[PDB]
Amino acid sequence: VYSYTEKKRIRKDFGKRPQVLDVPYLLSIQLDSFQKFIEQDPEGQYGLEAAFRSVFPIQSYSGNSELQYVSYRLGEPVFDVQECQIRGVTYSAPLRVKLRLVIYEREAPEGTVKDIKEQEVYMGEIPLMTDNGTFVINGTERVIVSQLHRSPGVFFDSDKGKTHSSGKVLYNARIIPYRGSWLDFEFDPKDNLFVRIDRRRKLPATIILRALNYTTEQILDLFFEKVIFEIRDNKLQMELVPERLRGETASFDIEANGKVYVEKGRRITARHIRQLEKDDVKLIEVPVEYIAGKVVAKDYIDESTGELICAANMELSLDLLAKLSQSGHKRIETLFTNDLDHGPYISETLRVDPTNDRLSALVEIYRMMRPGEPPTREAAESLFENLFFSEDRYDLSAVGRMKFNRSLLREEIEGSGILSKDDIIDVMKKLIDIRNGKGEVDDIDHLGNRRIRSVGEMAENQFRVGLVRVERAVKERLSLGDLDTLMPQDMINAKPISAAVKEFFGSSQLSQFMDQNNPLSEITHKRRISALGPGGLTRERAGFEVRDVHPTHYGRVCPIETPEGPNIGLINSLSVYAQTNEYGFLETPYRKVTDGVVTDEIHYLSAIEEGNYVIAQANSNLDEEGHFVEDLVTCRSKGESSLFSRDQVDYMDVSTQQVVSVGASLIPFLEHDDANRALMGANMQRQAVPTLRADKPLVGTGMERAVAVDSGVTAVAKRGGVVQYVDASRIVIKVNEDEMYPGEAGIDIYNLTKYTRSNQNTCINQMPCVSLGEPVERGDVLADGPSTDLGELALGQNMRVAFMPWNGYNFEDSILVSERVVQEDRFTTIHIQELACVSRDTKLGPEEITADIPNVGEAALSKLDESGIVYIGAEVTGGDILVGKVTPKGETQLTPEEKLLRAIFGDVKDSSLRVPNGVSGTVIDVQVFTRDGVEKDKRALEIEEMQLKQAKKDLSEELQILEAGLFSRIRAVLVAGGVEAEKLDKLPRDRWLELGLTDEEKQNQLEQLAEQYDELKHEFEKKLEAKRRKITQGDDLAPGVLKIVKVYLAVKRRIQPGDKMAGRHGNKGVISKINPIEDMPYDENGTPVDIVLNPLGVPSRMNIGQILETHLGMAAKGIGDKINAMLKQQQEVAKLREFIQRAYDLGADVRQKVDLSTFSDEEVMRLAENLRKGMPIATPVFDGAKEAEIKELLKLGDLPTSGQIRLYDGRTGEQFERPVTVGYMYMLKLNHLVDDKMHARSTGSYSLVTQQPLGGKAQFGGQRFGEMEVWALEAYGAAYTLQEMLTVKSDDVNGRTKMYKNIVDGNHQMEPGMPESFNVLLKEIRSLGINIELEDE
Amino acid sequence: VPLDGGRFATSDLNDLYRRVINRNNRLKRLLDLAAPDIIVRNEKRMLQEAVDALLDNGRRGRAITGSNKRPLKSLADMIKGKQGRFRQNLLGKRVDYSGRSVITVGPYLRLHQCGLPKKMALELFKPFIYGKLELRGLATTIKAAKKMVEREEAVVWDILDEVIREHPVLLNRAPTLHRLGIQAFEPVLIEGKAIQLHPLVCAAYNADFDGDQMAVHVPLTLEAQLEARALMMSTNNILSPANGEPIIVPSQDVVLGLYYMTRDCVNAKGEGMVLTGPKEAERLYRSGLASLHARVKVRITEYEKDANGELVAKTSLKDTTVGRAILWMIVPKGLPYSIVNQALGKKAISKMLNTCYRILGLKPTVIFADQIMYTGFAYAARSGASVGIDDMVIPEKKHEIISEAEAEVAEIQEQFQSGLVTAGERYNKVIDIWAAANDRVSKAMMDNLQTETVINRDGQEEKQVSFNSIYMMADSGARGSAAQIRQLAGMRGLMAKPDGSIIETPITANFREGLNVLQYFISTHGARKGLADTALKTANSGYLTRRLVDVAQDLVVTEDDCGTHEGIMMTPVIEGGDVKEPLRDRVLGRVTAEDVLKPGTAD
RNA sequence: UCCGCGGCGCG
DNA sequence: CTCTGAATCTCTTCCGACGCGCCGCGGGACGTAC
DNA sequence: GTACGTCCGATCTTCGGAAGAGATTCAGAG
Ligand SMILES: [Mg+2]
C-alpha cells in the first residue's frame, strides 16, 4: 500500500481515529485566483472580458465613430525564469488584442458604417505564474498577500453609550458599494432622521425622497398607516380596529352596542383584547378631546372655495374640524402614531424640513456638495443621474447585490449593479423597524460580513483604472477623428497601462519583498490574510474587537498562528482544510450524518449555514457503523458548547487537524502546552535557518511529506521510470513505456539548482538523494533541497538533552554547550553576500575598470589578474580591495608657458571597490553584465564561453540521445522489409540510407527518416545559434552605465557564544559558555549529555510537553541503538525482522497494520541500516499517544519505567541524590546570529547637515541617546557627565579636535565651547520673521 | 548631494525656493508692461499661496506634493513631531565611543565587575592606547601606532590590560524606566564577542537573556571617571529610590538551592550525633557519611552587638541541621542565630539581608550577598533537582467529583426543563456549583500533594512534608503560584467569554491529561486578550510617563528650612473593613510639623 | 544614500 | 414684540513608545530641438 | 533615440478624544 521510496524508511505512526479525507493542495489559493484572469473563458465572467465589455465600447460625441473589441491573446515569454532572475529582467508575456474601428455615415446614424479596418494591436505586459506561486521582477522573487476587507452591502451600527452621554443610543445605515460613492443615514439625539453623502454635512432624509419626484402624501402613505374618522349624526366617530389598541389606557368608557366593554380611564387587558376581538366592534364614537392631539396626513381642500382648509402634516384642532365639517368633508384620515410602535419621527422630520420642492431639494444638494457655483435644474439633474444610477461611476458587485437582497429578506439573490427607489424605501423601513426595537443590527465582527480579496481582483482594479484613463484620452482623440488618415496604433499608448501594472507589482502595500529561507517560511507566507493595505484599517486605529478572535473563526482562520508586535490579530492565517467560495467567502468541509450513520460524503458549508445546524466534535468516539455509543455528545448550536440527543445533528468534523494552520500543526503534544508558548514557538520555527547537513526529526506529525511535496524546491518526478545516468548537477530519467508518448519518445532531464543567493544572504542548494539504477514512481522525490531529507522536511537536530541546574550557567535561559557537537560542525551554517560593482557612464569620460592604480602595494594587485579581477577561489580579508576602478575628472587647463613651472615644484582618480571590514572569506563566483555597444574584456569572454560550453554540452547530449533513439527505431524498422540482422551493424551507423531495397514503404521511409535526421540537425543548429546569440548579446541596463559587475563572497559562520537557540515550544535561550567534553555529567555507560537547560521554566510557563518529547526521544534512541548494536554483530535477518515486527505492532489499534512479510530481505536490511540512527515516530495533533503508550515503548527497551536515571557529577565525579530527567529533543537554530548586530565605533564620519556621528552598519556609526535616557541620567546627580556627553563627543568640532590632541598628549581635560545644533536652530528661527538674540553675559 | 551617477538629490526647500522666485520674477516682469488688473491680482494671489506653501504645505486648504504622492516638507516640519529637530537631533543624538552587543551571564564574576570582549576593548580605547604607547616611546608618529594596532601584536594586549585596570565604564539598556536602569562597573577583559554581567543587575534591569541588546559608553576626562566612580556604583545603589524595598533580592536559582538546603527529613544517612564546628560539618558532608540536611546537635559561637556597638561572643549548644551550620559558616559576626533556623523563605531571606544592611553596614552586606550566591550555585549544582512526569500526583477522586458535578448539573437542567427556573437563575446556580466543585477538588489536590511523603522514621511510620520537586519549586516562592500548580495538576476551572460574560462549560482537564478542541479554542480568547493588552499598553505608558516628566523638570531643592508652621492631619486609611495601610508605614521617614504629644495630655 | 517613504522582523 | 443671551449645538485641529535590525524604492513627465 | 525647457486637477471616504471657537437659538425680562 506504499510506494518504493516510502518503504526505504517508514515512520512509525500513532493514531486511533480513522481518516476520511486527505490533505488538499496547500498552494491552492493563488493558483485558483490567477487561473481565472488570463484564461479566455466563454461568455465573460470574473475575468478580463468583464472589464473589457465594461470599458471597451466607446463612442464619440455623435461623431459617428465607435471603438470596440474582438478578442485578446497572450504571447510566449521572451525568456525563461532562470535567465530572468539571473539578468534581473521581468518574467512577463506579451498582451495582444485585436480591435475594430467603425465610422458611421451621415444623415443615417442607424445605417451601415462607411468603412472598417482591422489590425492586431499590442499594449501591456503582465508577469506569469511560477509553479511556486511567486513573482520575479528585478531578479528578486516577490509574493502578493490576499487582503481581507468588509463585504459590500448594507450595515447597521449601534454605538452603545459613548455618544450623547445619556444612554440614548443612535442608529445608522452604512451603504458600501463595490465601486461607487458611499451613502449614510443617521439619527439624532432629538430623533431626527438625517443623511450624509461621502461624509459631508448633515441633511434630512426626505430631501432625496422628494428629489425622486415623490409627493409628501405618497411618502406618508408608504411609511404610515391610516386612522379614519367619519362624520355622522352627532359629529365625529372612528372605525375601531382591535390591533390599534394594544397597551393603551382608554380616555373614556369604551362601550359599543349599548354595552360596556372597556371601562373608563383604565388600561387595556388581554381579557379585554379577547372581548374586542370576539364582539366584532367595527365602530365606536369617541370624544373630540381624545382626537385633539392628532395630526392630519393628506391635504383637504374645499372645492367651492378652491382653497386649502388644512395643510398636510398639521396638528388638528377643533376649529379646523368645524371648518371641514361645514365644508362638507365627511371623511377624515389620520395617522396611528403609536407611542411605542410607530413614533412620528418621519412626521417630525418633515415638519423640520425647510425645502418642499423637487427643484428646491435638487438645488440644496447641488449647492451643498459644491458651494460657490450657480445652480441650474439641468445641472442638478445631470449631477443626480451620476450619483446612484450611472453604471460608469457607481457600481455594486453581484455579491454586494446578493448581500443586499439577503439583508432585506428578498427572494432573488440576483439584480442590477445599481440601487433603486424601493431599495431606499425599504432600507428606511428597516431603520424604522430597528428603531422600534424589533429586529437586530448586524455585527461587523462576524465572518460572513467580510470578504477575502485575491491577486486577480486588485490586478483587474488597477487594469481598469489604467484603461479608463487611456480610454478617456482615446475618446478625446476620437472626438477629433479623421478620414482613415491615421494608423490604429497611434492613438493607443502602452505606457500608462504598463506603468499602472508595474507600480502595482513593484511598490504596492501588498507587493512586499517576500521572505524565503525555509520551505515552511514560503508555505506560510503565501497563505497569509492581512487586514491592512488599501481598503483596510490602519495600524493605529485598530481596536480590541478587530484583533479579537470571533466564535465563528473555528475551522476557517487559525487563532493559534499570528505574529506578535504592533500588528496582532490582523495578519492571521487561514486553517488547513479551509477553501474559498464561488462568491469569495470561506468554507470548511464536513461529513454528512444520517439518522444513525455518518456517511463518508463531504459537503461544503457557507459562513452562515452552520447557525441553523449543529456540528459534532471530531474526537467523538463511535462504533464501526457510524452510531455514537454515547447519546449525550458535546456539540455547538451557535458557538454554545452543549450536549444534545443521540439524533439531532447534520454534520460532524472531518478530522482533528482542521482547526489549526500548517505552522502550528508541526508542533507535537500541542494540547499539553500553553497557547502563548505555541505562538512564540510557531514564530521561532518560522524564523529557522538551514544548515549544511540535516538530520531527520524523530517526532513527526504526518504532513511533513505533504509539506515537502507542496513545496516546489524539490524536482518531483512527473513520470516514473528507472534512472539511466546520475550526476551531482544533472539527472536523467528513462521514461516508462506506458507513460511515454508514441511520437517523439524522449527522456527527461532534471538539472539541479546549485549554490545560489537567497533573500536572507543564505544559500539555496539542491543535492541528489537517490541511487543509480533504481526504479522510481510518478510524483516522487529525486533530489533533496535545503533542510529536506528523503521526502520529508528536517529543520533542527536531535541533541542529548538534560534538565538540571548546573553551577548557574543556566541562570534563567542561558545554556551550556559541549564542543563535541561542533567537533563535527553539524550546527555550522554557510553565508553568502552579494557585492555590487558598476561601471557608469559619467561626464568627462566614462570610468575605467582596471587595476592600474598608483599608491597601492604590489600584493594588492598580486591577487588581481591582468584584467584587474581577483582569481576564482582566492581567500580575502576584511577591508581589502575587491576590484580596481579609476574615474576620469578632467579640468586640465594646460598652460603652454607655465607647463614647465608645474614640473619645477609640485586626472583619472581611482575608485577601487573594497570589501567591508570585519568580513572575510573566499571568492566563489563573479558575474558581469555588459550592455551592448561596449567592448567586453577577456574575463567576460571566458565567462560567455563558460555559458557557451554549458549550452553546447546540454544541447549535444540531448541531440545525441535523440539520435540514439532515432537510429534505434531506424534499425527496428529496417529489420522488417528487407531483413538484414547482421549486415546492418557490420558498417558504422553513419551510412544507413542507400541500402538496396525494393519498392516498399520501408525504403521510402528510410529516405524520409534520413531527411528528418538532416532537418532535426538543422533546427538543432538554429536553436544553438539563437541561444548563443542571446547569451553573447548585450543586456539592457540603467541609463548612463556601461556594465555592472556582481561579486559573490562565501563565508562559513561557525557557532560561538551569544547566538540564539530555541526548541519547538518557544523555550528560548542564548548559549552562554562552551565547556569541555569531560566536565558534563555522565552516566554508568559513559555517554554524557551535551546540552543543559533550566528546569525552573516549567513551573512558570504553562508548558509541560517537553518531558513527553524527552521520553519519546529516550524510547526512539533506545530502539535505534538497540538496532545498531544488533547489526554491529554480523547477524541473520530473521531476528531483525521479528524485532522490527514486534516494535511496529506495539501499541493500541492504529491505521498502520504493516508487516515485513511483504518486503524483500535486501529492502528489509536497507531499512534496518537506515533506522540505526533512531526510530522515527509520528503522532497526530490531538489523537497522540498517552503516557501508557510511552510506558510500553520504555518497557520494550531497557530504560527505566520512570525514565529518570541517576547520574555521576562531571565537575568532581559523584552521584547526585536524585534521578534526573534526560533525553533527546529537536532543537532549532535561528537566523539571528551574534556577530551581525554587534558593532562599535571610536571615531568616524560626521553628517553634513550637523556635525554628528552616523549610525548603523553600512555606515560606521554609533548609538543614540534618547530623551528618556537624558531623564535617567539627570535623575542621578552627575552634572558634568551629561555635559561631556552633549559637548565633547557630539558637537564641538574645535572642542573634539582639541581634546583629541590632549588625549594623544595624555591629558584628559574638558572645554565646553559652543554647540552648533543650537546655532542651526537659531538660523532656522532666523529664517522666519521672528528675531532671536543672546543677551549680555 | 549628488547621488549615484550624474544625478543630484534635492530637498523640497530648493523646489519651493525656485517656485517662489519664479513667481516673483513673474510679478516683476508683469508690472513692467502694465498688465490688466485681473491678471496682476490673480498672479499676486498665486504668489501668496506660493509663499504660504513654502512656509507650510497644506496648512490652509489642499496640500501639494512632488513627484511622489508624499506631501512636500515645510519649514515647521523640522520642528514639529518626532522628525522635528528637537526630539530627533537636539534632545537626543548619536554619540561616538559606544558599543552594542548581546548579554550573557558568566556567573564567576563579582557584583562590581563585568566582562567585555577583546576586540571591543581594542576598538573603544584606541586614543588612550595611542597616548600610552607614545608615552612609553614605542612609536614616533600616529601612523606607526596605527600600523602596530593594525597588526595587534602581543605588545599591545598588556598595554590594554594596563589602561583598563581602574577605569570604570557605564552600561545602558534601551527600555529603561528607573534611574537604576543605568549602572557603572569596572570592566574586566574577557575573550569572546559577548559581554558578561552579574546575575543581580539584570533583575533590576528587568532584562532576561533571550537576546536583548545592551549599550555601553566610556567616561573621558578625569572628572567624568571619578564622578562615575562616586555615585552610580552597585554598592551605592542597593535600595530603590521609590520605596524602601531592596533591589538586591535573589530571583530564581540560588533561592531554590537555599530552600532545598534548609529542608530536613526525619531520617537519613548520618543521623543523631554531635559535632563541634562547621569545619567538621563540611568535612562530613564532603566525606558523604551524612545527609546534607540531617538534624544534628552542634555548638556555635556567634557575636552580638547588644552593647554600644560592641560585638560580644557567646557560645552554647543548639539543635539544627547540617546545612544550616554550613550556611552559618558564611555568616559574619553580628547576625543572631535564630534568623536561619527555619525554612528560609524568599521574603525571609530578603528581610534578613535588609536587616543586615540596616545594622552591620554596607561592605559586609555586599560581600555576604556575593559568597551567598556563590555557595548557592555550588550547592544547587550539587543537588541537581529536576522535574518529572510523575511529579503531578493525580488525585483518584477527580473522576468521581466530575461525575457528581455532572449529575448535579443534569439535575439542574431537568429542573429547568420543568419550567420552574429562569435561564439566568439556573445559569448562576450552575456557575456556583462549578465553583464549589473546583474549590473542593483544589483542596483535595493540595492536601494530596502537600504531605504524602511517608517514612518509617526508625519507628513504626510517620508522615512529613512532601519532597515533590514541583512542590519545592512552588513553595519556595521562586516561580509559580497556587493557581499555576492547581491548573498543572487539577482542572483549571472556569474562564470568561470575550464579551465579559463567563461560559458555563468548565475545563475539566489539566495540561497533564489531554484537552479537547473546544477548551483550547475558548482559552485562545483569554490568551489573545492578555497578549493584546500587553502589546497595546506600552505606547500609552510611554506617553503618560513623558507627559508627567516634562512638567516637573524645574522643581529642585534650594533651601534648608522654609520655617513654616503648617502641617497636615493624616490618618491611616480604612475603607470600612480591615485597615489598608497602617499609619507607621505611611509616616515613616518624615519630619514632624509640630511637637506631637503622647495621649498623656500636657506631656 | 547621505534623506524621505514603504515593508518585514526583533526585543 | 424685542434684545440679549447664556446655554447648547456644531465645526475645526492635534496628539498619540522606543530603541533598533534588515530589505525594497527613490523627479518625472512630457513636449521641443537635433 | 538623447540633451534640454519647463512645470505639476478629477480627485477618498471607515479614530477616539478632548480642547476650543464659533454659530445658533429659544427663554425670559423689559
Ligand atoms: Mg527580551
Numbering used by the authors:
A (entry chain C): 2 to 907, 912 to 1342
B (entry chain D): 253 to 855
What does the paper say about this structure?
We reconstituted an RNAP EC bound to NusG (NusG-EC) on a nucleic acid scaffold that directs the formation of a canonical post-translocated state and does not induce pausing. The initial reconstruction of the NusG-EC resembled a non-swivelled conformation, but to further investigate the dynamics we performed heterogeneous refinement in cryoSPARC22. Three classes contain strong density for NusG, and we observe differences in mobile RNAP domains compared to previous reconstructions highlighting the flexibility of these surface-exposed modules (lineage-specific insertions SI1, SI2 and SI3). The three classes differ in the extent of swivelling (up to 4.4° rotation), and represent the conformational states of the NusG-EC. The binding of NGN to RNAP was previously suggested to be incompatible with swivelling, due to steric clashes. However, our reconstructions show that the swivel module can rotate 4.4° in presence of NusG because the tip of the β-protrusion is flexible and accommodates NusG during swivelling. NusG does not appear to alter the intrinsic capability of RNAP to swivel, but several additional contacts with the β-lobe, β-protrusion and β-clamp may disfavour more extensive swivelling (bottom right). Thus, the binding of NusG does not substantially restrict the swivel movement of RNAP.
